[PDB]
Each structure stands twice: as C-alpha cells, then as structure tokens.
Write an enzyme that holds these catalytic residues in place. Sequence first.
Site, mmCIF file in Angstrom:
data_model
loop_
_atom_site.group_PDB
_atom_site.id
_atom_site.type_symbol
_atom_site.label_atom_id
_atom_site.label_comp_id
_atom_site.label_asym_id
_atom_site.label_seq_id
_atom_site.Cartn_x
_atom_site.Cartn_y
_atom_site.Cartn_z
ATOM 1 N N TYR A 185 0.406 -8.760 -1.708
ATOM 2 C CA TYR A 185 0.809 -7.410 -1.331
ATOM 3 C C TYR A 185 2.304 -7.251 -1.583
ATOM 4 O O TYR A 185 2.779 -6.158 -1.888
ATOM 5 C CB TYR A 185 0.429 -7.134 0.130
ATOM 6 C CG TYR A 185 -1.047 -6.825 0.259
ATOM 7 C CD1 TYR A 185 -1.535 -5.542 -0.003
ATOM 8 C CD2 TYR A 185 -1.969 -7.833 0.540
ATOM 9 C CE1 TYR A 185 -2.907 -5.275 0.007
ATOM 10 C CE2 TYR A 185 -3.340 -7.576 0.551
ATOM 11 C CZ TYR A 185 -3.801 -6.297 0.282
ATOM 12 O OH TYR A 185 -5.156 -6.056 0.277
ATOM 13 N N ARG B 35 -6.163 -13.881 -0.115
ATOM 14 C CA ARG B 35 -7.457 -13.984 -0.774
ATOM 15 C C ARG B 35 -7.426 -13.925 -2.299
ATOM 16 O O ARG B 35 -8.445 -14.167 -2.949
ATOM 17 C CB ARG B 35 -8.416 -12.914 -0.229
ATOM 18 C CG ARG B 35 -8.142 -11.486 -0.678
ATOM 19 C CD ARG B 35 -9.155 -10.531 -0.027
ATOM 20 N NE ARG B 35 -9.227 -9.244 -0.718
ATOM 21 C CZ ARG B 35 -8.349 -8.256 -0.571
ATOM 22 N NH1 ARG B 35 -7.320 -8.391 0.255
ATOM 23 N NH2 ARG B 35 -8.488 -7.138 -1.272
ATOM 24 N N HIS C 45 -1.622 -6.775 6.391
ATOM 25 C CA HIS C 45 -2.925 -6.845 7.035
ATOM 26 C C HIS C 45 -2.799 -7.378 8.462
ATOM 27 O O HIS C 45 -3.492 -8.316 8.858
ATOM 28 C CB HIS C 45 -3.886 -7.707 6.211
ATOM 29 C CG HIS C 45 -4.409 -7.015 4.991
ATOM 30 N ND1 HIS C 45 -5.340 -7.585 4.149
ATOM 31 C CD2 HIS C 45 -4.150 -5.783 4.486
ATOM 32 C CE1 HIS C 45 -5.635 -6.734 3.182
ATOM 33 N NE2 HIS C 45 -4.927 -5.633 3.364
ATOM 34 N N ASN D 92 0.834 -1.201 0.000
ATOM 35 C CA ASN D 92 0.000 0.000 0.000
ATOM 36 C C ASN D 92 0.871 1.255 0.000
ATOM 37 O O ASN D 92 0.553 2.243 -0.666
ATOM 38 C CB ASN D 92 -0.925 0.006 1.225
ATOM 39 C CG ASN D 92 -2.137 -0.897 1.052
ATOM 40 O OD1 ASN D 92 -2.714 -1.375 2.030
ATOM 41 N ND2 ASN D 92 -2.541 -1.117 -0.193
#
Length: 721
Positions: free
Chosen positions: A239, A293, A230, A180
């Site tokens: 990620y 996921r 996360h 992110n």
Amino acid sequence: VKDTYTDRLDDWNGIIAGNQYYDSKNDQMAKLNQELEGKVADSLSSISSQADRIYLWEKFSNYKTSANLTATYRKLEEMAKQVTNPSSRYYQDETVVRTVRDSMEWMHKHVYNSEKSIVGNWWDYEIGTPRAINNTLSLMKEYFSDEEIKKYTDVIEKFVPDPEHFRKTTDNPFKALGGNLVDMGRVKVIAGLLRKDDQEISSTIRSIEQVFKLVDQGEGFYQDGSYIDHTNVAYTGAYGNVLIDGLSQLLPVIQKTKNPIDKDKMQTMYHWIDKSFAPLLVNGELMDMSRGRSISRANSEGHVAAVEVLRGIHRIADMSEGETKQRLQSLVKTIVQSDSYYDVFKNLKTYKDISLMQSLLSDAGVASVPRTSYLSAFNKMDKTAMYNAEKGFGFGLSLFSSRTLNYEHMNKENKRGWYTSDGMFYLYNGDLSHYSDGYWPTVNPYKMPGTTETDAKRADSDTGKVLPSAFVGTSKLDDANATATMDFTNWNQTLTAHKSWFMLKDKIAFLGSNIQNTSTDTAATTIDQRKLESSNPYKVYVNDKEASLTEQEKDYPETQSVFLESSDSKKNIGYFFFKKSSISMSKALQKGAWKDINEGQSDKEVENEFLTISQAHKQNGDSYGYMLIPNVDRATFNQMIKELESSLIENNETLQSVYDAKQGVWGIVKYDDSVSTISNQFQVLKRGVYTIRKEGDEYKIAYYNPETQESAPDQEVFKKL
Ligand SMILES: OC[C@@H](O)[C@H](O)[C@@H](O)CO
Ligand SMILES: OC[C@@H](O)[C@H](O)[C@@H](O)CO
C-alpha cells in the site's frame, strides 16, 4: 473543447503513456511498444463481434466477478495508448477507434452504469475500473465529445461521490487514507478534469493532502518510519508502494492546477523515501515482510515490486531541484546498478519512466556509490531491517504484537502465511533470487525460518490475529547494533517462548528460552529453510566435517556448528551453537503451485530445492541459542566461533544476553525488574530491551520498553559498578 482542463489531461497522457517521448531507435522503448502491439492484437482477434453479445471477452465474461470489469476496461486503455502512438501499427486505425467507442457504449449499457450496484469487490467499482475509464477517455479525448465523456464518467460519480470515503454506496463505508487515498486522486482528480468540474478537483486535492501528516495511531506513516494500513498491518511494501507510485504520477498535474499543494510537504515525501522505503530495499529487492498478502502473487516477487517504489522516487526526483534531485537520482541509480538479478526495465511501463531511468543511468554527473550500513527499528509496525555494507548482507526480522496483525489473508490471497511474523527472519545475500523464482509457493509454510511452532495442521481458511502480549520490540544503539525480543505465544495458545535477537554488526544471535508446550503436537524451531540454486551447490559441514544431506531427515546430536559453503563467499552461511545442540537437517525438492496460496493465481506446478535445519523441543523449559554468521569463508568462520566461545552471557526465563568482546557491545533482554549484574561491569534494572557499548570508561546506552513504547532516563535502567 480545448482549454486548461485538456492541457492538464495532455500532461496526464504524457505520464501514463508518454507517446510524445517515443523513439523507435530506443531499444527499451521499442520493447514496450512491441508488448502493447501484441496485447492489442490479441484483444482485437478475440473480441466478441456478434450481434447482441453477452461479453466482450470470454476470458473476462462473468461480470459477477468484479475483476472482469477492470480487466475489460484495461484492454480498452491499451487500445487507446496504441491508437494515439504514431509509431504503432494501430495509429489512428479506424477499427480500433470504433472498437473503443463502441465498447465503452456497450459496457455502459449492459454492465457498468449508475443504475448498477457493487457486486463482488468494491475496489473494482471504485478504483480499478474508474481509473481505466479515466485514462482511456483522457488518451482518446479527441475522439469523444464532452457530452459522451460526461456520460461515461457519470457512473464514477455515482460510486465515488465523496473524496474522503470509499464504499459510500454500501452499508459500511470507510475513511480513505494512505495508498487508497492516493488512488482516490487518480479517480476523482482526473474525472474532474474530464468533466471540467472545479469543485471535484479542488475538494479531492484537499482530501489528498491528509497523506502528508505524521500519525501516532491508525493507518499511515509514523515518526520511526513505519507504515500501517488495513487498521494494523505493516504495509510499506504494497500500500505504501501505491501511495508513492500513484502520488508521483499525480503531482505534476496537481501542481499546475488552481489548487497546487504547498511546496513544503515535498520535504515530507523526501522523508518517507529515506526513512520508510530505502531501508526496505536491498540489492534491488523490496523486503517481503513489508508486502503483506502481495507475496502470494507470482508477477509481484520482491525485485518486481521494488520497481514500483523506484519509479516513484525517480519521478519525484524529476520534480525536485538541485541537490535533492541529484541525491534522489543517486539513490535510484545505486540500487538499480546493485541488482544483477532483475532488469529494472521489465517493470517500467511508460515511455517517460523508461526515459527517466535511462538518463539517470547514463548521466556521469549522478553518483552511484554502494549504500552504507544501516539498521532501522520500525517499532510501530514491529519489523526490523538491517544492512551491512562492509560484508554485503541484509537481515529482516518479522514480528507482530498486540498492536499488529501477524499476516493478512483476504480476497483469497496468502492462504498459508500463518507463521510469517512469528519471529521469522530473512537473510539477503549474494543469491538475489532467493525469495523469488517461486519461493512462496514452494517453501514449507509449517517451517518458516526462525519460527518456533508445533506441527498441528492449519486451515487455509484461517485469518490473521494479534499477539496477546505487547512485549515485542527493538532497542537500537547505532547503525550496526540492536537488540529485539518477542514474548511469543502461538496461534492456539499451546506453546510459548521468549524469543530474542542480538544484531551485532556482522552476525545475529538467536536466543530462545522458556519454551513450553501443552499440546499433543511436537514442537520445534526452524533454524533455517534456505532455497537452493542448482548452479551454486552448497558443501555442508557439521562440526567442520563434511556431511551428506538427503531428502530424509538426518539427526546430528552434539552439534557445535553448521557451515554452508558456496564457491561465492557472499553466499556462505554459518550457524554457531553456543552450547552443543541436537538438530536435524535435510535437503529436498519441494513442489507447489501459486494457486495453492492465492486462488487467482496459476495452478501450474513449481518446484525448488530447500535445505531445512531444525531443533526439536521435547520438554518444558527448553531453549535454543545460536549465532548466524554470513558472508565469511570456512576458515574465517572457524576462527570467529573460537572468538565467540564465551559470548553467551545468559539465556533463561528472565534474562537473555550476548556479548561481543571485539566491539565491546552487549545485547540484553530483561523480562522482569530484578537487578541484573552483567560481566561484573554494570547492572541493568528494568524489564525491557538494551544495547550497550563500552568505550574506555564510558558506556553508551540504548534502552527501550516495548510495552509502553518508551525509552527511559539512563539512571532508571543502568548503573555502572
Ligand atoms: O502505537 C502505534 C502502534 O505501534 C501501531 O502498530 C498501531 O497498533 C496500528 O494500528
Ligand atoms: O486485529 C485486531 C483488530 O482489533 C480486529 O479484531 C478488528 O476487527 C479491526 O480490524
């Protein structure tokens, strides 16, 4: 206005599109161009062009669903790429130029502006859409005024004013790190260049530098190669992908700004590649246990996801020099050439990426040698990756503990990943397509390979959990031998089992003890659930006698071995039960749809044939014990089980151990501090995991205490007799 900012934007355009590198005579490039031509044509023929419209495209009309904002702006980015491509039929087209300009204005006035608030997923408002807007304006900067550019990016500053945090306009912002944080760069560094804002550019690059730090807690990279995101989820493969994919795109631009990053942290990037990413890549596939996921996305199966990492690596190699550049090129080259299933170009979406890959593959100066054997114990994220180069198979062990979440189900994705970390194992063999071609929506989620579970129904609405125990971990001795254990308790605390694994170079022993069940549900361990190929059928043998499997479950009491024989030895799988066991097997067609496991996916039916092997546990104190032996032919397998006849040292509630006499290696798991005498040669003294090798009168020792996450002085845990 032309200046240093626009110079940087020109470089960015060469990276995100690369029209300057286009060559109509280049087959792979022409293919991508054709794809973009088709996408633009589709957008132009379906765009609403009536007076005072309610949406630009009906397929993405409900702006309450944030995903529709990003999808809309991405259609405009596609137009920008083609309108600036001399070879496109839309090059400098008057309708396309006006459509992009008019569309930016419409969205700005009725859908996305500073007066709006986040509705739906924050990601679209702060990353997805801003990146699409940035790239569109960057590519078409010669068609917009600086005033219009500032006007259309003001909204980005409203939603993302602080380069250290996301969700700043909500009632629960968060500190940006990892992937992110890299996207924060693709948002604010580019917006900064477009807005000619030195402060935004410098402060954002400053924040980005946090990504190079080694962490010992929280999100980020650990010294053992693990990557957490996360809060507590193993996430190198999703990620982590974003981090390297996005950072490699930004670096060429950043290094040319007045705030370049110290060329010392590139050594840190090289370390991520070798320690964190490389181990998770087998025959061109990125191990699903590291993708969270994302395994529930049809367009992101293992080999496809792997390209995000590979293109990041080849970009980094391009900004490197000498040996480092050549070795990184060699890593990418050997992985790509080992992939006979997926065409890497299918996921190289810019002309520069296509160009870099082609030069690497055709450059005889770049070595392409089969990768050597390795075994990575990613203890900080509770995963283990093993690869044997001599026989050619990979092995993945997916666990979780009090330190990590078992599975991630969010944004309506991965609804049935309940048991994907309950001691699930992966085998990577000659069938490179095994975990692809619809594996995830067709695999029976209640019987993930290697897991011990009850048959109670599970709800799609459930979310992940951490394990009660911290006694989960791997002790690695060398590149081919390691031992792991998991003090397992199921989701509703009705079942327990001491599960252990003994990785012994060319085989893995699975031992389970202390199996208890306090529920009314039936308990069993899934030995395997293998997806089959209609082209390469398996001939099944039980106790070396051919067996005919049916959709209906068949019981095989007193089973000593099971062998799955293919015409290709590299696809063979054998299971040797140390002690005769009662198992059941079946071969059946399983149907499902991606939408079943991910709300935003297609409801189109998918189907695959699976061979399931299981062992029921009807009494408390039950156990299981078998050796997985892949990639050998039938006669060799039969010879090996004879050699391994007495390899099982013990399998009870306090001690589990397997011995490889050929190697002189022992794998040992102790659940208490009693003195355990092994093979009348030595004693191990502490609760923990061991992998020991005897060389002459010498003993090599590898001990790991998974609870304290520490090894220990030799004399504290080992004593020769
Ligand atoms: O000691 C580090 C732990 O192993 C990690 O998995 C953290 O719990 C991540 O949140
Ligand atoms: O997964 C275990 C964690 O402690 C969660 O319960 C927290 O809410 C943070 O994600």
